[PDB]
Design an enzyme around this catalytic site. Sequence first.
Site, PDB file in Angstrom:
ATOM      1  N   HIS B  81       0.828  -1.197   0.000  1.00 40.05           N
ATOM      2  CA  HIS B  81       0.000   0.000   0.000  1.00 40.05           C
ATOM      3  C   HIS B  81       0.867   1.253   0.000  1.00 40.05           C
ATOM      4  O   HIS B  81       1.851   1.351   0.739  1.00 40.05           O
ATOM      5  CB  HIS B  81      -0.910   0.024   1.230  1.00 40.05           C
ATOM      6  CG  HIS B  81      -1.898  -1.100   1.296  1.00 40.05           C
ATOM      7  ND1 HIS B  81      -1.555  -2.373   1.704  1.00 40.05           N
ATOM      8  CD2 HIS B  81      -3.228  -1.133   1.039  1.00 40.05           C
ATOM      9  CE1 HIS B  81      -2.628  -3.144   1.679  1.00 40.05           C
ATOM     10  NE2 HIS B  81      -3.656  -2.416   1.279  1.00 40.05           N
ATOM     11  N   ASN B 112       8.121  -3.808   3.761  1.00 40.25           N
ATOM     12  CA  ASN B 112       6.713  -3.471   3.930  1.00 40.25           C
ATOM     13  C   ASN B 112       6.262  -3.699   5.367  1.00 40.25           C
ATOM     14  O   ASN B 112       5.603  -2.841   5.965  1.00 40.25           O
ATOM     15  CB  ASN B 112       5.865  -4.296   2.964  1.00 40.25           C
ATOM     16  CG  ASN B 112       4.389  -4.031   3.118  1.00 40.25           C
ATOM     17  OD1 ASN B 112       3.983  -3.009   3.668  1.00 40.25           O
ATOM     18  ND2 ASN B 112       3.570  -4.955   2.630  1.00 40.25           N
TER      19      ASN B 112
HETATM   20 MN   LIG Z   1       2.047  -2.201   3.766  1.00 40.37          MN
END
Ligand SMILES: [Mn+2]
Lengths: 300, 299
Positions: B81, B112
């Site tokens: 994201h 991440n």
């Molecule tokens: Mn993430």
Amino acid sequence: KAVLEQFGFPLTGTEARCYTNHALSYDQAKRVPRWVLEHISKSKIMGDADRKHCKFKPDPNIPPTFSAFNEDYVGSGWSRGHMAPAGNNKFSSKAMAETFYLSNIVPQDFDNNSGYWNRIEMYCRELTERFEDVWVVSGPLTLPQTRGDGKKIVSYQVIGEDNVAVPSHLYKVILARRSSVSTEPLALGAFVVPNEAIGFQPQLTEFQVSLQDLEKLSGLVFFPHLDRTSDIRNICSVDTCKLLDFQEFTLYLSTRKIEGARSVLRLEKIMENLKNAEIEPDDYFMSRYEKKLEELKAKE
Amino acid sequence: AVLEQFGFPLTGTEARCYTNHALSYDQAKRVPRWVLEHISKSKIMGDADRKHCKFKPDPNIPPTFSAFNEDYVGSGWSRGHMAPAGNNKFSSKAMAETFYLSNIVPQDFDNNSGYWNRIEMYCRELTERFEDVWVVSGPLTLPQTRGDGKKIVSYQVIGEDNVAVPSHLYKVILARRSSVSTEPLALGAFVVPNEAIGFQPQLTEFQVSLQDLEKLSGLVFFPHLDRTSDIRNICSVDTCKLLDFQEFTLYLSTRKIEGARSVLRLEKIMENLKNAEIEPDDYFMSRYEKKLEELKAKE
Ligand SMILES: [Mn+2]
Ligand SMILES: [Mn+2]
């Protein structure tokens, strides 16, 4: 949403920019154009505009922080290659000068620029003899290759302090209409050539791609107003898609060199090299040759 | 207007607005160029559950230029994201839209869940001190310099659709203390590599000037913001301190409690945390012994 946009969305700078005889969308991250659209006709490729008087310069409309500069190109091993050719703007010295803005330029192989790419340009101009209107979209492409471990990699050099991206390939989308009244379907072709020396062995159709496949590679939609459900002819079926061969292209190159010959002996060498290749001069070559010889006899 | 008779080509970079983020898409790389979000104390609170969301193509992106789950799954890269789901607990709709692949970038698994996540937590933490926080995130493909001086940009493209795997990621943070505050604004730009980053580098090591980041990305951030005005460096008006190992490892452990479906796995969270030479804080022991009694009431 007002809250998100309170201080403005980031600016990408891809707005279409219109000039006298071409339009382009600029890639502020790569310092090259994303695409350059032009229209060609019989009258546009005729005139007194001299490319010798033109100079490469940063596009004054481009924010300087995102512009390329001559220092990025000179000495880098790459040439400043037009996307919208200067030879398409003989009719207007203002249109030609604007093709020398660096917003229209990509780092291009010297031999490709003066060779296979030039011949494609010439073929585009030749199409105006058989079609009334010709649209051309040119631009760079950074394509991937398959590394040694099977994984696909995009690798390209970046030159100068401004980090101008060197494309791996160049593309051209040619759209030709017989006339604005005619009922004949339009002729279209997409072509992708590597940014390197090509030569005379490969015919232009060996670099032809489908419009769909090029749009997937470039992330662009070319000629969106054109309705694809209708019949669009393959330009390499309705026309020739044949570039000039070695003999014709050399004769063409040797004819241009006449006008720059500043001495009689330069001029006879041009003839010499042309004879050594067993390329017989044509009538047009001789007329310019004789014209230049007496001209040089009348100068100090 | 004879050039436009059949239309200029389409780059598809127009701003796309959603419930709580906006983005400009890169149809060639099949990743966003930038994702802008607004954060506040209210947004990051609510009952929106991450585990109810699925990654899906963006329904507004042309399928020919969209990425698909088949590109990411098995590629060795996580769907990362830009606008984090954790910033949209107030709205299940907002959170779901951050799982559109138009907000997603191929991201290193450790990056991440590790250093990048910690940066996301610091941004949410800012809402304690600033009533409004704007964040712009996106990928970056930067060159590396060969031993002869040539600068080469090299990145992988994954999947049938050739989704670009960026070398770096960037965040631009802009924070305002209140709409009635005379205190100047706070801004900072950061660029981290898209790879494992430990706990030794502090966030300020990855800080760059906004001029530099803009030159590298070809973007102009917050153009309506007057830069001649009083704009403070975020890392002088705030701490720019990410969670250290103990803080972060404890935060990760407290959250794995809620997913423990059996007692024997619940105490291994306790065991792994103790073997990590970290002492359970009150909040851990709180939710821990609560989940322990809950799991005794089920099966
Ligand atoms: Mn993430
Ligand atoms: Mn050229």
